[PDB]
Amino acid sequence: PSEKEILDALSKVYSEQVIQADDYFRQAIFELASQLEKEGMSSLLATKIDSLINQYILTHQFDAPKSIFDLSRLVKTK
């Protein structure tokens, strides 16, 4: 479960029309992916993406594109 796979999974989520259409989630994902790219992965960052993706999933009543669930899965693993 590598630093790059998570970064790519973030980018996949970021590119989603429903994420692009929403200024809070778009920027949030953008910031987390930049922190990862810059500093690498961490416990903390894992926690932050987890919280953001939980928030996205719950806010949308489990109606989220596959990539969101894919990302969610990856950061849940660690």
From TrEMBL:
Keywords: Bacteriocin immunity. Coiled coil: none annotated. It comes from the Bacteria. One of its GO terms (biological process) is bacteriocin immunity. This is Bacteriocin. It comes from Streptococcus pyogenes serotype M1.
